[PDB]
Amino acid sequence: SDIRPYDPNTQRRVVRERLQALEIINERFARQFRMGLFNLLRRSPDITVGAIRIQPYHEFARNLPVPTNLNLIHLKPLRGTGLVVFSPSLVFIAVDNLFGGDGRFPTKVEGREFTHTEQRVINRMLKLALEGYSDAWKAINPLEVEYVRSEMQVKFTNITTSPNDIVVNTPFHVEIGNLTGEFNICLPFSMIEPLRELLVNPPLENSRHEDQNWRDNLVRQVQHSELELVANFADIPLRLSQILKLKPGDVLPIEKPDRIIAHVDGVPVLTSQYGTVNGQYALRVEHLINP
Amino acid sequence: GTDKSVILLMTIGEDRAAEVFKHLSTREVQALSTAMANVRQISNKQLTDVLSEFEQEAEQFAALNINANEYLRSVLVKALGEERASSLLEDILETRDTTSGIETLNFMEPQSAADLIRDEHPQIIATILVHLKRSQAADILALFDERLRHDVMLRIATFGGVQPAALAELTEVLNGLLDGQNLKRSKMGGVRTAAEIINLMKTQQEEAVITAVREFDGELAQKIIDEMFLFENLVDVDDRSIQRLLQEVDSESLLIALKGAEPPLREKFLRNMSQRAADILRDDLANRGPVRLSQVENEQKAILLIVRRLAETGEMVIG
Amino acid sequence: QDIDLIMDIPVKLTVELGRTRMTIKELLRLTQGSVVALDGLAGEPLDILINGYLIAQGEVVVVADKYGVRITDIITPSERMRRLSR
Amino acid sequence: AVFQQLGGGDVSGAMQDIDLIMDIPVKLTVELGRTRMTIKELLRLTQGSVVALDGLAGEPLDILINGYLIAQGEVVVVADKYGVRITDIITPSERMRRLS
Amino acid sequence: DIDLIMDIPVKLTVELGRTRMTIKELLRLTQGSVVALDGLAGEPLDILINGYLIAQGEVVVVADKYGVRITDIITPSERMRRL
Amino acid sequence: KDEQLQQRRANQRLGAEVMSQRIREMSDNDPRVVALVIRQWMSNDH
């Protein structure tokens, strides 16, 4: 028997789920970003998509280097705030290539911050990155990507209510010539959760008309399914002691039921007034309990 | 008129056109170079009429344009002095500013620029340097750490040209920083002013302040001492002091120093030696050809140092 | 095996009008004033349950201007077994 | 017959505002877990026994005020004192999911 | 008769915290706000049956599922002190 | 008409050859004045 003391703040919540739809969106975005980078840098980059990592937010935060450009982005209409992380190496490579450099010298990063010119270069790159990501998402679910803010430290973002929240991280590796760099795209699981059934199964070559026809027929098929409806006349609170002495012939007082709740497996569906019709216990339906 | 000017420049010749371009602004030179080789139009009558009309009006401004800056510089030099002429010329040059902030960066002090661009990416630093004036860039790299200095110099050696968009972005970034602020730090009072201030106070305070400066830095004290007594107050030295100092002044060094000196100074300094010695010195000065001021300045400095040492000892006076 | 330990724990007792099994179709077209029956004849004792577990049977009785359940019997397991079986 | 008989006082009903009742103490309670269990195992329980709870370890805990579930939070330890961190107010759908 | 109430289901809960608050305080709570608990760390958690306290015990996790070890059953002497 | 055109062309090619010599002496006298006049012409062209 395994029995160990409960320790809070321990990484005990494990939620592993393959995300095929994200697995293809990543390659589509990588292809779009590669040509965007070719268009900008006038060079030939190769982007390798890494394995999607489903990890608590503080793991993602601690694995990041300091300083690193973080780009808070809004993936409307999905409520939340995603993050696009550009490594110092990648921005160094881009600035070197733009400003008359054939990347001859090795990239040197020693905690140096980002100037206004570097920030503008990163904004120019991030415009292409966001356009590519939006186009890639457009195939499955049309989303609009808005860049709201850029930061350099990790403690300024806090896109997760708690550091133990679970986020989805995709690291890409971009190589230009001999130089290499990496950049990540992190989405909080709260944003993805309404689209989990869409992001879980691999996409199929269908149409929106076919999809809506599918659930329509399924909805119609569901309607022909019998349910069990239970009407509760009264709910009287008695102690255990009363129940054992309880014996036939006793009278347990109850209050006036103005309305009668009808529930299916616990969930209330109807409130209706009791009655007798055709020798049967009947209910006059008064109100369907809408949410 | 630009096409006519380009045609005239083409018909003038390579040397004349090159001289005109060297005496022309960057935009004008670029436009003239582009238009002349691009499309050239020759008119039997219209070109001749335009040339005659242009020639008929070049009367008053020609004399002004012949000598404008040189005359102003000479007037500034002769008016107050070399030190004030430099300040006046600097103010006149600063009156014409630069639009793009990159060029405005070379009017800033070297340390201010070094602090401003130290944190930038090394390639951006390199791009700023080739656009910046060479003298300024050298000072900036001197103030830069040796690692950054070597890295930026290497980037300078193997520069490969900037994308126009990136250059425009850097230009507007620097413009947004240095457009609405004045960078003309007025420098009033260096060492000439310090020497002038020192020369007018009591001797005890004079020696106290010069020894304090020497304790702080000997080079500054020596520069203050040299600026204290220039090679122009020797006319106010007493005849006895001049005769006493003549015993320790080399004839060749004295002649070299007095070759470029004022005639009054030579006459005053020739009354302390013998008549034969004065005649020999005059003959040597007449026979001496022109020489570079570098050696004459050193000889005058040596003579002034000897005179100052004699005065400090107590064997010389002034009047 | 304590007895006074749980001698005082409270339980909540519920009473039903009746069972009925009806599909999504009729449930969605139920409107205000619509009447639906139940599987029990008007007169059988209602089933008393605790935590969804059968405990007793009794019907409602009117004494003066007040209501209460008059329990008819207590179901032994044998009867519970035939309840599940049929 | 001292008390006077009041009746017909159902004039109307309308929410006024939530500050008339503000400084009223609430009984806040965080819940570790639940488990449906019968009396069978109940008396079988002795000192040192372990009862498994339906809630999976590490899941957000439940927060109730006066015994009514309002929000789901996460447990944290601050200065050696237990503390819950409110994460999300529950939805009517999860409320009924809890009920069933 | 014991056989009748020896089989019935009942709902068991264990509460980890207990705090008294006003509404200024409850409304002030936002997302991510940390609410302190009157209960010190390591003290026995209350165990309730249908909202009725019967026992106290420590928190322990077994096989990745929450649990509690019954340290003791409170005699009604402590109930006066519970209020 | 051909002879008159040829004579006019010869005069144009003689006086222009003289004009080219004339513009060289003036520019050697003042090189910056010519550049200033050219810049003024461009400014007035706007």
UniProtKB/Swiss-Prot annotation, chain A:
Keywords, in A-Z order: Bacterial flagellum, Cell inner membrane, Cell membrane, Chemotaxis, Flagellar rotation, Membrane
Entry annotated with the keyword Membrane: yes
Claim: Endoplasmic reticulum is one of the keywords in the record: no
Annotated CDD domains: FliM
Gene Ontology biological process: bacterial-type flagellum-dependent swarming motility; positive chemotaxis
Primary localisation category: membrane
Topology with respect to the bilayer: Peripheral membrane protein
Any one Gene Ontology cellular component term annotated for this protein: bacterial-type flagellum basal body
Pfam family of the protein (one): FliM
GO molecular function, one term: cytoskeletal motor activity
Superkingdom: Bacteria
Subcellular location(s) of the protein: Cell inner membrane; Bacterial flagellum basal body
UniProt-listed InterPro entries: CheC-like_sf, Flag_FliM, FliN-like_C, SpoA-like_sf
Residue runs in coiled coils: none
Entry-linked PANTHER family: FLAGELLAR MOTOR SWITCH PROTEIN FLIM (PTHR30034:SF3)
Its job: FliM is one of three proteins (FliG, FliN, FliM) that forms the rotor-mounted switch complex (C ring), located at the base of the basal body. This complex interacts with the CheY and CheZ chemotaxis proteins, in addition to contacting components of the motor that determine the direction of flagellar rotation.
Family: Belongs to the FliM family.
Full protein name: Flagellar motor switch protein FliM
Natural source organism: Salmonella typhimurium (strain LT2 / SGSC1412 / ATCC 700720)
Gene of this entry: fliM
Curated annotation (Swiss-Prot), chain B:
SUPFAM superfamilies documented for this protein: FliG
Topology relative to the membrane: Peripheral membrane protein
One of the GO biological process terms: chemotaxis
Feature type site, description Part of the EHPQR-motif: 155
UniProtKB keywords: Bacterial flagellum, Cell inner membrane, Cell membrane, Chemotaxis, Flagellar rotation, Membrane
Keyword Transmembrane: no
Molecular function as annotated in GO: cytoskeletal motor activity
Primary residence: membrane
Part of the EHPQR-motif, short sequence motif: residues: 120-123
GO cellular component: bacterial-type flagellum basal body; plasma membrane
Keyword Zinc: no
Protein's cellular compartments: Cell inner membrane; Bacterial flagellum basal body
Pfam families recorded: FliG_C, FliG_M, FliG_N
Job of this protein: FliG is one of three proteins (FliG, FliN, FliM) that forms the rotor-mounted switch complex (C ring), located at the base of the basal body. This complex interacts with the CheY and CheZ chemotaxis proteins, in addition to contacting components of the motor that determine the direction of flagellar rotation.
Family to which the UniProt record says this protein belongs: Belongs to the FliG family.
Name recorded for this polypeptide: Flagellar motor switch protein FliG
Source species: Salmonella typhimurium (strain LT2 / SGSC1412 / ATCC 700720)
Lineage, top ranks: Bacteria, Pseudomonadati, Pseudomonadota, Gammaproteobacteria, Enterobacterales
Gene symbol of the encoding locus: fliG
From Swiss-Prot, chain E:
Subcellular location: Cell inner membrane; Bacterial flagellum basal body
Organism: Salmonella typhimurium (strain LT2 / SGSC1412 / ATCC 700720)
Main function: FliN is one of three proteins (FliG, FliN, FliM) that form the rotor-mounted switch complex (C ring), located at the base of the basal body. This complex interacts with the CheY and CheZ chemotaxis proteins, in addition to contacting components of the motor that determine the direction of flagellar rotation.
GO biological process: bacterial-type flagellum-dependent cell motility; chemotaxis
Record has Metal-binding as a keyword: no
UniProt similarity note: Belongs to the FliN/MopA/SpaO family.
Name of the protein described by the UniProt record: Flagellar motor switch protein FliN
Keywords: Bacterial flagellum, Cell inner membrane, Cell membrane, Chemotaxis, Flagellar rotation, Membrane
Range of the intact protein held here: 53 to 135 of 137
GO CC terms, sorted: bacterial-type flagellum basal body; plasma membrane
Superkingdom classification of source: Bacteria
Membrane topology: Peripheral membrane protein
Entry GO MF terms: cytoskeletal motor activity
Main localisation: membrane
From Swiss-Prot, chain F:
Stated induction or repression of this protein's expression: Inhibited in nutrient-poor medium.
Assembly description: The basal body constitutes a major portion of the flagellar organelle and consists of four rings (L,P,S, and M) mounted on a central rod. The M ring is integral to the inner membrane of the cell and may be connected to the flagellar rod via the S ring. The S (supramembrane ring) lies just distal to the M ring. The L and P rings lie in the outer membrane and the periplasmic space, respectively.
Residue range from the parent sequence: 514 to 559 of 560
Family statement: Belongs to the FliF family.
Function comment: The M ring may be actively involved in energy transduction.
Underlying gene: fliF
Source organism, top-level taxon: Bacteria
Compartment(s) where it occurs, according to its Swiss-Prot or TrEMBL record: Cell inner membrane; Bacterial flagellum basal body
Protein name per the record: Flagellar M-ring protein
